Ligand SMILES: Nc1ncnc2c1ncn2[C@@H]1O[C@H](COP(=O)(O)OP(=O)(O)OP(=O)(O)O)[C@@H](O)[C@H]1O
């Protein structure tokens with residue numbers, strides 16, 4: 001047991017409608033949990049709760065450990081690509097190199113004369129959205145953390161790159177890590193240990209891929 005939610009309900013608006021209603025799950029160390037559902041279902045809000053940014057109105061959240069969060073929206077601080085990835089933490093050569101490879105940043109870095117020492121301005125608006133997204137993922141995965149919260153880290157990448165990085169980073173590099181991945185792709189759900197499908201704040205499904213089927217679930221993963 002590393003993350004537990006029991007009977008969790010929450011409101012952003014003090015007197016409005018619940019953003020999450022009666023959420024239940026448990027994640028054990030090293031497991032991959034897929035959190036799926038359409039726009040507005042409550043996926044990011046669920047992560048906010050784990051991070052203590054959204055307090056429950058009822059129920060219990062039990063988690064132990066340092067969180068590393070990859071936001072749905074990429075961000076870039078003033079500094080080099082290297083400094084953005086390392087982000088405070090001490091530099092470990094092997095760790096750094098493996099993350100850069102897993103997030104396909106080798107080819108990008110090589111194209112600048114200053115390499116990963118190129119200086120970016122706040123927002124990194126001279127880079128592409130894909131480049132910023134892969135740096136933001138690299139930043140999250142480089143961190144020594146107990147719980148990795150990855151909020152749609154491939155939403156600004158093409159389908160092939162998404163497949164490749166899901167494999168190289170989430171599946172291979174992070175194989176021993178406790179991961180919560182916001183994603184609705186069938187391939188990703190198939191590889192997850194557990195799946196939570198949210199629909200309009202509620203738990204539409206919680207369980208394994210084999211349970212999911214044996215019916216119309218896939219319609220609830222879209223939009
Ligand atoms: N950090 C935040 N602070 C305040 N309100 C938020 C925050 N994140 C989400 N909300 C609000 O909570 C509600 C639930 O939406 P949420 O962002 O959790 O859905 P989601 O499943 O992440 O959607 P998407 O797939 O579009 O990213 C929305 O009304 C949203 O405006």
Ligand SMILES: [Mg+2]
Pocket residue numbers: 043044045072151
């Ligand atoms: Mg979201």
